[PDB]
């Protein structure tokens, strides 16, 4: 169907560096090639068309090129807000085809996380369940370890976590971990702690509470 092989699948660049993505046509597309930028949670956005034309508003940092079968998208002074997934597209013949996509991630300076912990709400407790939330805000690199400790005993099998996409402004990440117990088990302990380990910390950071108010 005239496939567009797009490389690389992933890229890690620093602000100001030059990035280039390539799409090689399976057949041959004169110049009907476009590029879209898809920021986290957003829908694709037209960046380039006709292989080298830039849609309105699109900054000069983005330049397209190539003809026949090989096409490239180049982003010069890489900015933070340029982090996203990029897709090339062939619209010379039907069916319209899209390249596989390239995820452009930003490399930045090390930033330790700020750690917060939230005891379960009274509304939840009255419902028979207790969830404790540990927040790791704005850190870099994304790798981080969270360990739940109740009365100084390491927990296992009772927590879930998710990490945000990279932030388009400060290129950091944030993480949320939830320790869920039954209101019964939660009442058999007094010290709930969240122990955090990360590259920006010289040793484990612990945030905890007892059960006041």
């Amino acid at each position: 169907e005239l496939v567009m092989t797009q490389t690389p699948k992933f890229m890690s660049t620093t602000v100001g560096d030059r990035v280039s993505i390539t799409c090689k046509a399976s057949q041959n597309v004169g110049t009907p090639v476009a590029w879209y930028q898809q920021k986290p949670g957003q829908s694709p956005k037209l960046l380039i068309y006709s292989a080298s034309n830039r849609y309105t508003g699109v900054p000069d940092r983005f330049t397209g090129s190539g003809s026949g079968t090989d096409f490239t998208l180049t982003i010069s002074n890489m900015q933070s807000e340029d982090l996203a997934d990029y897709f090339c597209q062939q619209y010379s013949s039907y069916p319209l085809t899209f390249g596989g996509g390239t995820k452009v991630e930003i490399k930045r300076t090390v930033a330790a996380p700020s750690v917060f912990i939230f005891p379960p709400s009274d509304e939840q407790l009255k419902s028979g369940t207790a969830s404790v939330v540990c927040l790791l805000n704005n850190f870099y690199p994304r790798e981080a370890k969270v360990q739940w400790k109740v009365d100084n005993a390491l927990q296992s099998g009772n927590s879930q976590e998710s990490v945000t996409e990279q932030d388009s402004k400060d290129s950091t990440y944030s993480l949320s971990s939830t320790l869920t117990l039954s209101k019964a088990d939660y009442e058999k302990h007094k010290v709930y702690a969240c122990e955090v380990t990360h590259q920006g910390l010289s040793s484990p950071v612990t945030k905890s509470f007892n059960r006041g108010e």
């Binding site: 169907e1 476009a34 879209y36 829908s43 694709p44 956005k45 037209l46 068309y49 849609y55 897709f87 597209q89 039907y94 069916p95 319209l96 085809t97 899209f98 390249g99 596989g100 996509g101 700020s114 917060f116 912990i117 939230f118 005891p119 379960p120 709400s121 509304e123 939840q124 419902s127 969830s131 939330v133 927040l135 805000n137 879930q160 976590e161 998710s162 990490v163 945000t164 944030s174 993480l175 949320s176 939830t178 945030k207 905890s208 509470f209 108010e213």
Partner: protein
Amino acid sequence: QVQLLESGAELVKPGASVKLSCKASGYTFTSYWMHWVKQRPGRGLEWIGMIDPNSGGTKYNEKFKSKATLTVDKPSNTAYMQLSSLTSEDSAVYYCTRRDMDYWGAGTTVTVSSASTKGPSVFPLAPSSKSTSGGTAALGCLVKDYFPEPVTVSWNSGALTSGVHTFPAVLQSSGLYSLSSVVTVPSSSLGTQTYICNVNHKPSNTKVDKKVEPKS
């Protein structure tokens, strides 16, 4: 402003059929063709087909020739796409975009499952001395035990966006989802500003507004 607004059932049973819609505004609906694109989270984009809101002419992708059926409604300036014999592989996000793909809608999420929907419970993550940092305080809402995704979360009706982190939902062993939405605000105005998370889960008709207050 040119605007494409998609909408439709986000939870549908396997083997069933669902009709998605795209309401266009800000331009002559009948003067531009409409495309429908498919996207599976973290995966690539696929062109489903297109239609001429003027004639009714349709051009489909051989792949979805038998899965989708596009149509339009001139009076309401809206295009529709119906998917039949749904299977787990039809679960994805669907977009509608103008002929020149210069304008795209926000997209509609479809989850093909025989499991029944479940609305979330919304609990406050109250600001306190344990959620304080450099003069700032983190607070938020815990949205737990809902099916299927997605659940939209806004703060103060969209007036509060800075410092907001609405985390990807996690899957609990029970098969239900949970997610947290947090925000960092000034510690000095905790006594004068009001923070409310607005949670919406369409499949369960859930619409909640939970005011988050300091732990006292």
